Amino acid sequence: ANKGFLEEVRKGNLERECLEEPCSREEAFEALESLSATDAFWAKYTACESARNPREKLNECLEGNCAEGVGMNYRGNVSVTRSGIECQLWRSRYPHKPEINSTTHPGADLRENFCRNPDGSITGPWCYTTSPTLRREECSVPVCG
Ligand SMILES: [Ca+2]
Ligand SMILES: [Ca+2]
Ligand SMILES: [Ca+2]
Ligand SMILES: [Ca+2]
Ligand SMILES: [Ca+2]
Ligand SMILES: [Ca+2]
Ligand SMILES: [Ca+2]
Incomplete structure (x- = not known):
């Protein structure tokens, strides 16, 4: 958090500094290197x-097996919709x-055809x-809790 007496003279760390x-x-960046793991992190962190x-409860939501809130943190392997229709x-x-994709929303993990919510649609992971x-449709994912 940047709050001591000379903390920034030291090696940044993820547990200490962000968790x-x-x-x-x-x-976070300073504690990660890869900008790529920072995009990935920052995304599942802000969510x-x-x-x-x-x-x-933090370790739960960062893990992404459950939708927390609108499920912007969700990173699970469920790929079939609300209707049962498989995902593209x-x-x-x-x-x-x-129109939403990896270059546009790189922190999200648009892998395979798995439900996500890159956007934070109020109906959750789609x-x-x-x-x-x-075209699009909400998916039924387990809620954080
Ligand atoms: Ca600190
Ligand atoms: Ca710091
Ligand atoms: Ca710094
Ligand atoms: Ca630092
Ligand atoms: Ca600790
Ligand atoms: Ca501390
Ligand atoms: Ca810096």
Whole structure:
């Protein structure tokens, strides 16, 4: 958090600096190296802001197996919709040409065809469907708690 007497003369650390105290993106960055793991982190971190405490509650929401809030933290391997319709590869461009994708929203983990919520749609984790008629649709993922 940048709060002592000479903390920044030391090697940045993730537990100390961000998981034990709140942090700036620069502090996380400084403790990660890869900008890529920082994008990944910062994303699953900012989405867990309302689950800081307890910290077992923080470890839950950062793990991504449960949707917390609107499920922007969700990083699970569920890929079928609310209706049962399978999801379109995020990287596929057919049947629907996704406007949301890895270059656009790099912290999210648009892998395979797994439900996500890169955007924080109020209906939660979604994905694009394979049905030509239904572009996107919410998915049923276990809620943090
Ligand atoms: Ca600190
Ligand atoms: Ca610091
Ligand atoms: Ca630091
Ligand atoms: Ca600790
Ligand atoms: Ca501390
Ligand atoms: Ca710096
Ligand atoms: Ca610093």
